[PDB]
Each structure stands twice: as C-alpha cells, then as structure tokens.
Amino acid sequence: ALEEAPWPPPEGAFVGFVLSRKEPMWADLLALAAARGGRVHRAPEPYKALRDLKEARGLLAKDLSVLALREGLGLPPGDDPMLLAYLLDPSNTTPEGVARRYGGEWTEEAGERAALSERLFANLWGRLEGEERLLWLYREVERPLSAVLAHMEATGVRLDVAYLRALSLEVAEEIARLEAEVFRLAGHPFNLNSRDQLERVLFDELGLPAIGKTEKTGKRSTSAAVLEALREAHPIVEKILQYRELTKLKSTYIDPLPDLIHPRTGRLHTRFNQTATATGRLSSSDPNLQNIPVRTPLGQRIRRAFIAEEGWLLVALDYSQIELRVLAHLSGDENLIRVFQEGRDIHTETASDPLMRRAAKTINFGVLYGMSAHRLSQELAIPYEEAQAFIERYFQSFPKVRAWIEKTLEEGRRRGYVETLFGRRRYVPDLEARVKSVREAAERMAFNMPVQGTAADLMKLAMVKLFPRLEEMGARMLLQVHDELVLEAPKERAEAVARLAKEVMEGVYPLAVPLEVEVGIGEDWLSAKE
DNA sequence: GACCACGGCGCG
DNA sequence: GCGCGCCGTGGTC
Ligand SMILES: [Mg+2]
C-alpha cells in the first residue's frame, strides 16, 4: 500500500475505516479505504463506497459489518487480524496493542488502517502457520462467529420503554423513603452514595465494628458482605442494603436503558466484544446486556422490560451446569461423569437433606473458582475445621478432579499457559510468583480457564451452527449470556425453533457426559425463562 | 467535557 | 471465589 489508486479496490482487499464513535450502530462513517497488491484506495464518499465491497476484511471487520447492516447492506465480516492475535494470546484485546506487537501503528486515518490490516494479517497468519488447533478455532469458530455477532448487534432487542419510565418514578419514591430514614438514624444527612462518607458514619460515628478492608487503598469496607454481617448490630444496616439495591438497579438499568433506543430500528443495541476476555468468553457493552438483573424481585420487574416484537415470541435456552459437565469431561472423573450419565440432580447425588443439598450445590460451583475453605465456613456457618473437611471429602469422591487441577497447574507452570479442550490458550506467568497470595490467585485463574473457556468454545460453536438454521426459519438470534441464548421467533414457528435450537445446542460437540438445555417461550425475557 | 482509579455490584 | 462492564465518587486535566 504505497501507490494510490482511485476507488474502488479489487476483490479481497483489506479495508480501513474511521468511526465518529466506538459504537457501530451509533457511529458516523467518517472515512473508508482499502489495501491490496501494493495499492491503497480511498473512498471519495464513505457511505456510497460501502456498496462496492463484497466483504469486510481487516481490523474490527465485524464493527464495519454492523454499520453496513445498519444501512441495509449485506456486508459480512471476513478475516480480522484481531481474531488471529486474540487466539495467539488473549491479552491481545486492542488494535493499539496488536498493531504495536505485530508490525504497525493504529492511527486515525482510514488508508493507514487499511494498510495496517493487510500488513498485520500477513504477519499474524505466519504466526498461526503450524498452530493447527488455533487455526481450527479461527476457521471453525471465531471467524464465522463474527458474522453471527454482527447480525445480533444490528438486530437489537425490543424494550418496553413506557414501562421502565413508570418504574423509575415508583422506585425514586422508595429510595427517598429509605434515604430519609437512613439520615434520621445517622442523626445527620450525608451523601449515602459516597462509600467514604458512609464508612465514617458506620464505623466511627456509630461505632459499628469494621470487618474487612478494601483491596487497593485499605479503607474499611462497606461492601454488601460486610453489611450483611451487621444486619443485626443496627437498624441502619438493613436500610442501607435496601438503598444499595434500588439505586444500583435504578441508576444502572432503569434510567439509562430507555434513552438508548435507536431511532431507526426502535430497538436496543448491544455490542458483543469478541476479543475482550482472558478465557475466550464474549463480553457485552454499550450497554452491557449480559448482566441485566434477574435474581431479586425488582430485578425481575426490569427483565420483564425486554419483550418480543409484535407477532413474535422470545425463546430462551439455558445450558444446565455446563461448567461442571465440562469439568467431568476434562478430568475424566468416573464418579462425577456417573452422576451426569444417569441424570441425577447432582447436588444431591454428590451430597453422597436440606443443608446437605444446599452445601453440595455451592461447593459444586465453588471448586471451579477455588473457593476457600473459609468462605465455605461462612456460607454454612460451620467452623473452619468442618468446612475444610467437606472439601477433602468432596475430593476423595472426585479424585480425578484434584488430579486434573494439579496436572493443569503443573503444566501451566512449565509451558507458561493453559488450554481449553479445543486448545484455546491463556498465558499465566504468575504461577511461579514468590508471593503466595499472588501465586495462588494466578493458580485460580489458571485452572478455571480450561473450564470457563471450554464452556465458551462450546457455546460459540453452538451459535455458529445454529444461526444458519434460524435464518432459514425466519427467526433471529438476539442475545448470548455466556451459557444462555435468547432468540426471537415468529409465533407460528416459535415452538419448532425452540425444539431445533435446543437440539443443536445439546449436540454441538458431544462429551463424556450429556449436555442438557432448558428452553422456554414467552412474550418477555422473564416469561420465556420459565 | 474527558480521563482515571476505586469500591461496589449486576450477570454467567 | 473465576470472567466481565458500569455505576457514582473522588480527583485531574
Ligand atoms: Mg475495577
């Protein structure tokens, strides 16, 4: 890319482009260019020029496709060096960094971005020559997935705006009721939203016992974990907890979301970031729709705001304990495989009563993070000696797991990275740090990655297979929440879509244990998840 | 207006 | 106790 040739470029050229802002559904296309065969082409007028391309090839290809889709153009994303770099090392999350690392500089000029894409792809494609397992993931998973993601982003999800507007007004009144009561008890008003000001009121002015400290600055914590333990030591604690929940939900979801309705589509549009996590998971932002409330009663009222287009229904599909099932497969623990094989509730089969079923439930999902025998003692109110005993029992039942954990750590130590089932890797150097706390944190990141990552690989593969089947049925894929999918289907075909999608997901890639999926259909995200 | 670090907390 | 992104605060620029 030196010789400047008039627009348009030949087929298979690498594209460069500049957006007025990061969100492709909200961005003005400021500039457009392309590079191939030692030439560089600059679009005279970007929007018109966008019609000439057959495929978005280059850095951030998906983002350009979303924008093209926004304009009614079918311009699928192709090769993207970010995906190649992300597979080589998932700390490769930005074009700045990737450019610097593999032979260029991420500028604000379209033509230069185009030439940077061509050059980087050439280099990175070289790195992946011989990495057959990473190459497989690029071709069979990441690249095809990027097209699926572009369609999800361009499609958006419908939101009951009036409903949320109304909800805001109600919650505002309850928050006022809580804050006024807090201020009485405090004997003086202050900024309840300021944790620094709260810290002094609680532990200095009210003399409540401080418990824990914040991580970075070592102030006395006012976290929910701390407050919970004080729910009895003063009536102000409960009111603050109730205040925290309402203001969190109101300020993060109820108020901002209605203002984000796109004028042209009348729907809400997220971004599914494909090179953003250390484990291979997607992330979601602007806004994040992967952390919409669901666990509390108010959270559930908010979720009801996500609804199906008129004439359609939402279809919600959820993998059941995918990470546990993946661990059974990776570890090869016969006993745990056995609990899934004969379709047991696990949390009781593993218990091998009330406390024992809930204890087994938490521990089953604690071994994946390396839950400390302490937090366990906290969760069961059982001494640190008894909790520490369970874990040993849990592992005596499922020895292959400890062996896998230990084997995973040992290998990570030697090679400097760990792998998912498909060979997606994460580099974790701190496995040999000499500070115990730091080393043991790296360890928990390290042996969790193959599990969380494998689950992500499976879900991604499932999306790639499922998407074409949905198009041919006239249904849409709307959201992905790590181990869940939310589709939208015409009422007539909803039931059939629900049936097919479930089967696709369960049979995406058979393991030593079966994958289970629950599927519901409904007019709103909450209704559909029942 | 924008950036950051932090504590805090929403979800899987 | 793993993986994220966003809030308000507090501080800067
Ligand atoms: Mg943080």
Coordinates of C-alpha atoms in Angstrom, one line a residue, chain A residues 66-457:
Chain A
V66 CA -22.8 -4.0 11.8
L67 CA -22.7 -0.5 10.3
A68 CA -23.3 -1.8 6.8
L69 CA -26.2 -3.9 8.2
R70 CA -27.5 -0.7 9.8
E71 CA -27.7 0.8 6.3
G72 CA -29.5 -2.2 4.8
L73 CA -26.3 -3.6 3.2
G74 CA -25.3 -7.2 3.3
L75 CA -21.6 -7.0 4.0
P76 CA -20.3 -10.0 6.1
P77 CA -17.1 -9.8 8.1
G78 CA -14.2 -11.9 6.9
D79 CA -10.6 -12.2 8.1
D80 CA -9.8 -9.9 11.0
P81 CA -6.2 -9.9 12.4
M82 CA -7.6 -9.1 15.9
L83 CA -9.1 -12.6 16.0
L84 CA -5.8 -14.2 14.9
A85 CA -3.9 -12.2 17.6
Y86 CA -6.5 -13.0 20.2
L87 CA -6.2 -16.7 19.6
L88 CA -2.4 -16.5 19.8
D89 CA -2.7 -14.7 23.1
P90 CA -6.0 -13.4 24.6
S91 CA -4.3 -10.5 26.2
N92 CA -4.3 -9.2 22.6
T93 CA -7.6 -7.2 23.1
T94 CA -7.0 -3.9 21.3
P95 CA -5.9 -2.7 17.9
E96 CA -3.4 -0.3 19.6
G97 CA -1.6 -3.2 21.3
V98 CA -1.9 -5.7 18.5
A99 CA -0.6 -3.1 16.0
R100 CA 2.4 -2.3 18.2
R101 CA 3.1 -6.0 18.8
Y102 CA 2.9 -7.4 15.2
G103 CA 4.2 -4.6 13.0
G104 CA 2.5 -1.2 12.8
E105 CA 0.7 1.7 14.5
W106 CA -3.1 2.1 14.9
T107 CA -3.8 5.6 13.6
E108 CA -6.9 7.7 12.9
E109 CA -6.5 7.6 9.1
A110 CA -8.6 5.1 7.1
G111 CA -6.0 4.4 4.4
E112 CA -3.3 3.7 7.1
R113 CA -5.7 1.4 8.9
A114 CA -6.3 -0.5 5.7
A115 CA -2.6 -0.9 5.0
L116 CA -2.1 -1.9 8.7
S117 CA -4.7 -4.6 8.3
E118 CA -3.1 -6.1 5.2
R119 CA 0.4 -6.0 6.8
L120 CA -0.8 -7.4 10.2
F121 CA -2.8 -10.2 8.6
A122 CA 0.3 -11.2 6.7
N123 CA 2.4 -11.3 9.8
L124 CA -0.1 -12.9 12.2
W125 CA -1.2 -15.5 9.6
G126 CA 2.5 -16.5 9.6
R127 CA 2.5 -17.0 13.3
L128 CA -0.5 -19.3 13.0
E129 CA 1.1 -21.5 10.4
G130 CA 1.6 -24.7 12.3
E131 CA -0.8 -23.9 15.1
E132 CA -3.3 -26.3 13.7
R133 CA -5.6 -26.2 16.8
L134 CA -5.7 -22.4 16.9
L135 CA -6.1 -22.4 13.2
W136 CA -9.1 -24.7 13.6
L137 CA -10.7 -22.4 16.1
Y138 CA -10.1 -19.4 13.8
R139 CA -11.8 -21.1 10.8
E140 CA -14.4 -23.2 12.5
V141 CA -15.3 -20.8 15.4
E142 CA -14.1 -17.2 15.7
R143 CA -14.3 -16.0 12.0
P144 CA -17.7 -17.5 11.3
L145 CA -18.9 -16.4 14.7
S146 CA -18.1 -12.7 13.9
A147 CA -20.8 -12.7 11.1
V148 CA -23.3 -14.2 13.6
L149 CA -22.4 -11.5 16.1
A150 CA -22.8 -8.7 13.5
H151 CA -26.4 -9.8 12.9
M152 CA -27.2 -10.0 16.6
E153 CA -25.8 -6.4 17.1
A154 CA -27.7 -5.0 14.1
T155 CA -30.9 -6.6 15.1
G156 CA -31.2 -5.4 18.7
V157 CA -33.9 -6.4 21.2
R158 CA -37.2 -4.6 21.9
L159 CA -37.7 -2.8 25.1
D160 CA -40.9 -1.6 26.9
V161 CA -39.8 2.0 27.4
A162 CA -43.0 3.4 28.9
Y163 CA -43.0 0.5 31.4
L164 CA -39.5 1.5 32.6
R165 CA -40.3 5.2 32.6
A166 CA -43.1 4.4 35.0
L167 CA -41.0 2.0 37.1
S168 CA -38.4 4.8 37.6
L169 CA -41.0 7.1 39.3
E170 CA -42.1 4.4 41.7
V171 CA -38.5 3.4 42.7
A172 CA -37.5 7.0 43.2
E173 CA -40.2 7.3 45.9
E174 CA -39.0 4.2 47.7
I175 CA -35.4 5.4 47.6
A176 CA -36.4 8.7 49.1
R177 CA -38.2 6.8 51.9
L178 CA -35.0 4.8 52.6
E179 CA -32.6 7.7 52.4
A180 CA -34.7 9.9 54.7
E181 CA -34.8 7.1 57.3
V182 CA -31.0 6.5 57.0
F183 CA -30.4 10.2 57.6
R184 CA -32.6 10.2 60.7
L185 CA -30.7 7.2 62.2
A186 CA -27.4 8.8 61.2
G187 CA -28.6 11.9 63.0
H188 CA -27.5 13.9 60.0
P189 CA -27.7 13.9 56.2
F190 CA -24.8 13.0 54.0
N191 CA -24.1 11.6 50.5
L192 CA -25.4 8.0 51.0
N193 CA -23.9 7.3 47.6
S194 CA -20.4 8.0 48.9
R195 CA -18.8 4.9 50.5
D196 CA -16.2 7.2 52.1
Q197 CA -18.8 9.2 53.9
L198 CA -20.7 6.0 54.7
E199 CA -17.6 4.5 56.2
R200 CA -17.2 7.2 58.8
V201 CA -20.9 7.3 59.8
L202 CA -21.0 3.5 60.3
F203 CA -17.6 2.7 61.9
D204 CA -16.6 6.0 63.6
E205 CA -19.9 7.9 64.3
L206 CA -22.0 4.8 65.1
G207 CA -19.0 2.7 66.4
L208 CA -20.1 -0.4 64.4
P209 CA -17.4 -2.9 64.2
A210 CA -15.4 -2.7 60.9
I211 CA -14.7 -6.1 59.5
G212 CA -12.8 -6.1 56.2
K213 CA -10.6 -3.7 54.2
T214 CA -10.8 -2.6 50.6
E215 CA -8.2 -4.2 48.3
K216 CA -6.2 -1.2 46.9
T217 CA -6.5 1.6 49.4
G218 CA -7.2 -0.4 52.6
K219 CA -10.2 1.6 53.8
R220 CA -12.8 -0.1 56.0
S221 CA -15.2 -1.9 53.6
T222 CA -18.9 -1.1 53.4
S223 CA -19.5 -3.9 50.9
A224 CA -22.7 -6.0 51.0
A225 CA -20.7 -8.9 52.5
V226 CA -19.8 -6.6 55.4
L227 CA -23.2 -5.0 55.8
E228 CA -24.9 -8.4 55.8
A229 CA -22.9 -9.4 58.9
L230 CA -24.1 -6.2 60.6
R231 CA -27.8 -6.6 59.7
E232 CA -28.4 -7.2 63.5
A233 CA -26.0 -4.7 65.0
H234 CA -28.1 -1.6 63.9
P235 CA -31.3 -0.9 62.1
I236 CA -29.5 1.4 59.6
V237 CA -27.7 -1.5 58.0
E238 CA -30.8 -3.1 56.5
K239 CA -32.0 0.3 55.2
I240 CA -28.6 0.8 53.5
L241 CA -28.7 -2.6 51.9
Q242 CA -32.2 -1.9 50.5
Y243 CA -30.9 1.5 49.4
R244 CA -27.9 0.0 47.6
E245 CA -30.1 -2.4 45.6
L246 CA -32.6 0.1 44.5
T247 CA -30.1 2.8 43.5
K248 CA -27.9 0.2 41.8
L249 CA -30.7 -1.1 39.6
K250 CA -32.3 2.3 39.0
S251 CA -29.1 4.1 38.0
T252 CA -27.6 1.2 36.0
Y253 CA -30.6 -0.1 34.2
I254 CA -34.0 1.5 34.7
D255 CA -32.9 5.1 33.9
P256 CA -30.2 4.7 31.2
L257 CA -31.8 1.9 29.0
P258 CA -34.8 3.7 27.7
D259 CA -32.6 6.6 26.4
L260 CA -30.6 4.1 24.3
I261 CA -33.5 3.2 21.9
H262 CA -32.1 3.5 18.3
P263 CA -34.2 6.0 16.3
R264 CA -34.1 3.9 13.1
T265 CA -34.8 0.4 14.5
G266 CA -36.7 1.3 17.6
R267 CA -34.7 -1.4 19.4
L268 CA -31.9 -1.6 21.9
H269 CA -28.4 -2.5 20.5
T270 CA -25.6 -4.0 22.5
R271 CA -22.0 -4.8 21.3
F272 CA -20.7 -8.4 21.6
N273 CA -16.9 -7.9 22.0
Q274 CA -15.1 -10.9 20.6
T275 CA -11.5 -10.2 21.8
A276 CA -12.1 -8.9 25.3
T277 CA -11.7 -11.7 27.8
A278 CA -8.8 -13.9 29.0
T279 CA -10.8 -17.1 28.8
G280 CA -12.4 -17.0 25.3
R281 CA -15.8 -15.7 26.6
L282 CA -17.6 -12.9 24.8
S283 CA -18.2 -9.7 26.6
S284 CA -21.1 -7.2 26.1
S285 CA -21.1 -3.4 26.3
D286 CA -22.7 -0.1 25.4
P287 CA -24.9 -1.2 27.0
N288 CA -24.0 -4.5 28.8
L289 CA -26.9 -6.8 28.2
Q290 CA -25.2 -9.8 29.8
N291 CA -25.8 -8.5 33.3
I292 CA -29.5 -7.5 33.2
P293 CA -31.0 -8.1 36.7
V294 CA -32.8 -11.4 37.4
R295 CA -32.2 -12.6 41.0
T296 CA -34.3 -10.2 43.1
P297 CA -38.0 -9.2 42.8
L298 CA -37.1 -5.7 41.4
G299 CA -34.5 -7.2 39.1
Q300 CA -37.3 -9.4 37.7
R301 CA -39.5 -6.4 37.1
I302 CA -36.7 -4.9 35.0
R303 CA -36.2 -8.1 32.9
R304 CA -39.9 -8.0 32.0
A305 CA -39.0 -4.9 30.1
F306 CA -37.2 -6.9 27.4
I307 CA -40.0 -8.1 25.1
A308 CA -40.7 -9.7 21.7
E309 CA -41.6 -7.7 18.7
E310 CA -45.4 -7.8 17.9
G311 CA -46.2 -11.1 16.1
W312 CA -43.2 -12.8 17.7
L313 CA -42.1 -14.6 20.9
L314 CA -38.8 -14.8 22.7
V315 CA -37.2 -18.2 23.1
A316 CA -34.8 -18.6 26.0
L317 CA -32.3 -21.5 26.1
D318 CA -30.0 -22.3 29.0
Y319 CA -27.3 -24.9 29.4
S320 CA -27.6 -26.7 32.7
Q321 CA -24.4 -26.7 34.8
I322 CA -22.2 -26.6 31.6
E323 CA -19.0 -25.9 33.6
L324 CA -19.5 -28.9 35.9
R325 CA -20.2 -31.1 32.9
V326 CA -17.1 -29.8 31.1
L327 CA -15.0 -30.5 34.3
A328 CA -16.3 -34.0 34.3
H329 CA -15.1 -34.4 30.8
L330 CA -11.7 -32.7 31.2
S331 CA -10.9 -34.5 34.5
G332 CA -12.3 -37.9 33.4
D333 CA -13.6 -38.4 37.0
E334 CA -15.7 -41.6 36.6
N335 CA -17.8 -40.7 39.7
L336 CA -18.8 -37.3 38.5
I337 CA -19.4 -38.5 35.0
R338 CA -21.6 -41.1 36.5
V339 CA -23.8 -38.5 38.3
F340 CA -24.5 -36.8 34.9
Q341 CA -24.8 -40.0 32.9
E342 CA -27.7 -41.4 34.9
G343 CA -29.4 -38.0 35.0
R344 CA -29.2 -37.3 38.7
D345 CA -29.8 -33.8 40.3
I346 CA -26.0 -33.9 41.0
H347 CA -26.3 -31.5 44.0
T348 CA -27.9 -34.5 45.9
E349 CA -26.1 -37.3 44.2
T350 CA -22.9 -35.5 45.1
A351 CA -24.2 -35.0 48.6
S352 CA -23.3 -38.7 48.9
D353 CA -31.3 -33.4 53.4
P354 CA -31.8 -29.6 53.4
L355 CA -28.3 -28.3 54.4
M356 CA -26.5 -31.1 52.6
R357 CA -28.2 -30.3 49.3
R358 CA -27.5 -26.6 49.5
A359 CA -24.0 -27.3 50.8
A360 CA -23.3 -29.6 47.9
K361 CA -24.8 -27.0 45.5
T362 CA -22.4 -24.2 46.5
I363 CA -19.3 -26.5 46.7
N364 CA -20.0 -27.9 43.3
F365 CA -19.8 -24.4 41.9
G366 CA -17.0 -23.4 44.3
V367 CA -14.4 -25.9 43.2
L368 CA -14.4 -24.1 39.8
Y369 CA -13.1 -20.9 41.4
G370 CA -11.1 -22.4 44.2
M371 CA -13.5 -21.3 46.9
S372 CA -11.5 -21.1 50.1
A373 CA -12.4 -23.4 53.0
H374 CA -13.1 -20.1 54.8
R375 CA -15.8 -18.7 52.6
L376 CA -17.3 -22.2 52.8
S377 CA -17.3 -22.0 56.6
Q378 CA -19.0 -18.6 56.1
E379 CA -21.7 -20.0 53.7
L380 CA -22.6 -22.9 56.0
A381 CA -22.0 -21.2 59.3
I382 CA -19.8 -24.2 60.0
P383 CA -16.4 -23.9 61.7
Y384 CA -13.3 -23.6 59.6
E385 CA -12.4 -27.1 60.7
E386 CA -15.6 -28.8 59.4
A387 CA -15.8 -26.9 56.1
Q388 CA -12.2 -27.8 55.5
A389 CA -13.3 -31.4 56.0
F390 CA -16.1 -31.3 53.3
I391 CA -13.7 -30.2 50.6
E392 CA -11.4 -33.2 51.4
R393 CA -14.5 -35.5 51.2
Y394 CA -15.7 -33.8 48.0
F395 CA -12.3 -34.5 46.5
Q396 CA -12.0 -38.1 47.9
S397 CA -15.2 -38.8 45.9
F398 CA -13.9 -37.0 42.8
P399 CA -10.1 -37.6 42.9
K400 CA -9.6 -37.2 39.2
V401 CA -10.6 -33.6 39.6
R402 CA -7.8 -32.8 42.0
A403 CA -5.5 -34.7 39.8
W404 CA -6.7 -32.6 36.8
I405 CA -6.4 -29.4 38.8
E406 CA -2.9 -30.3 39.9
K407 CA -2.0 -31.6 36.4
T408 CA -3.3 -28.4 34.9
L409 CA -1.3 -26.2 37.2
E410 CA 1.9 -28.2 36.8
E411 CA 1.7 -27.9 33.0
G412 CA 0.8 -24.2 33.1
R413 CA 3.9 -23.8 35.2
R414 CA 6.1 -25.5 32.7
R415 CA 4.7 -24.2 29.4
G416 CA 3.6 -20.9 30.8
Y417 CA 0.0 -21.2 29.6
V418 CA -3.2 -23.4 30.0
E419 CA -5.6 -24.8 27.4
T420 CA -9.3 -25.4 26.8
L421 CA -10.5 -28.7 25.3
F422 CA -10.0 -27.2 21.8
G423 CA -6.6 -25.7 22.5
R424 CA -7.5 -22.1 23.1
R425 CA -4.8 -20.9 25.5
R426 CA -4.3 -18.3 28.2
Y427 CA -0.8 -17.3 29.3
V428 CA -0.5 -17.2 33.1
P429 CA 3.1 -16.3 34.2
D430 CA 2.3 -15.6 37.9
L431 CA 2.1 -19.4 38.6
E432 CA 5.7 -19.2 39.9
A433 CA 5.4 -15.8 41.7
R434 CA 7.2 -16.0 45.1
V435 CA 4.5 -14.1 46.9
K436 CA 2.0 -16.8 48.0
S437 CA -1.2 -14.7 47.7
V438 CA -0.2 -13.6 44.2
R439 CA 0.8 -17.1 43.1
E440 CA -2.4 -18.7 44.4
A441 CA -4.5 -16.1 42.7
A442 CA -2.8 -16.9 39.4
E443 CA -3.5 -20.6 40.1
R444 CA -7.2 -20.0 40.5
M445 CA -7.2 -18.1 37.2
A446 CA -5.2 -20.8 35.6
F447 CA -7.2 -24.0 36.4
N448 CA -10.5 -22.1 35.9
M449 CA -9.6 -21.1 32.4
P450 CA -9.8 -24.5 30.8
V451 CA -13.3 -24.9 32.3
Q452 CA -14.7 -21.5 31.6
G453 CA -13.0 -21.4 28.2
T454 CA -14.3 -24.8 27.1
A455 CA -17.8 -23.8 28.0
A456 CA -17.3 -20.7 25.9
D457 CA -15.9 -22.6 23.0

